[PDB]
Amino acid sequence: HHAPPTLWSRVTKFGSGWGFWVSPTVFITTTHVVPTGVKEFFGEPLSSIAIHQAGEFTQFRFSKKMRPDLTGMVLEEGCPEGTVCSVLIKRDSGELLPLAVRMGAIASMRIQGRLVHGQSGMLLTGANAKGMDLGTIPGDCGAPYVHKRGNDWVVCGVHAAATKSGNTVVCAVQ
Numbered sequence: 522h523h524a525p526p527t528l529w530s531r532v533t534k535f536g537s538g539w540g541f542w543v544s545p546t547v548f549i550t551t552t553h554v555v556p557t558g559v560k561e562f563f564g565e566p567l568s569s570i571a572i573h574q575a576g577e578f579t580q581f582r583f584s585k586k587m588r589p590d591l592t593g594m595v596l597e598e599g600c601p602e603g604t605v606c607s608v609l610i611k612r613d614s615g616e617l618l619p620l621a622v623r624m625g626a627i628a629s630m631r632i633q634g635r636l637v638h639g640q641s642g643m644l645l646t647g648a649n650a651k652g653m654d655l656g657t658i659p660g661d662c663g664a665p666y667v668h669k670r671g672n673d674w675v676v677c678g679v680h681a682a683a684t685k686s687g688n689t690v691v692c693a694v695q
């Protein structure tokens with residue numbers, strides 16, 4: 522494999538997209554994917570969830586141990602610029618599509634009206650990454666950006682946007 526099955530099992534369907542289990546109690550995702558006007562998430566009422574949203578990055582910390590099968594991993598404050606990361610794309614249809622990305626700079630961006638604390642990067646999957654097979658598409662938001670700090674995997678962002686060209690992607694960062 523590229524990424525272990527345990528890392529993929531952290532990628533969970535959520536709203537119009539996906540999120541990522543950092544630990545048994547920390548779930549991260551992309552803000553525009555998150556349900557609104559709900560009294561609960563994953564069965565838990567809001568009073569049992571520390572909810573924090575800042576410019577397309579959303580963190581939940583549950584009081585209940587939600588995924589105790591998991592150990593905690595590091596959430597970095599952004600990806601290391603210039604390094605190659607992996608976007609762990611799951612699809613509706615069951616495919617696992619880990620897309621390699623070389624990460625650009627962390628910058629602030631207004632995007633379709635919303636203020637994004639984001640980080641661009643360039644896919645390494647083809648000359649263009651237009652379309653379904655080599656790039657990110659609607660429904661993919663929330664997928665984690667990961668890389669290995671030595672012998673351990675870390676996560677540094679959640680997927681938020683891509684150009685129509687397809688080569689440039691943006692993740693939301695802390």
Ligand SMILES: *[C@@H](O)[C@H](C[C@@H]1CCNC1=O)NC(=O)[C@H](CC1CCCCC1)NS(=O)(=O)CCCCCCCC
Pocket residue numbers: 538553577632633635637641657658659660661662663680681682683684685689690691
């Ligand atoms: C996930 O919801 C979706 C994923 C995109 C769609 C097309 N290919 C993808 O990977 N994201 C969007 O549709 C995104 C949503 C906005 C909502 C407000 C906050 C920012 C994201 N819109 S978009 O189509 O990706 C807009 C183009 C992005 C340009 C990026 C410029 C980089 C410098």
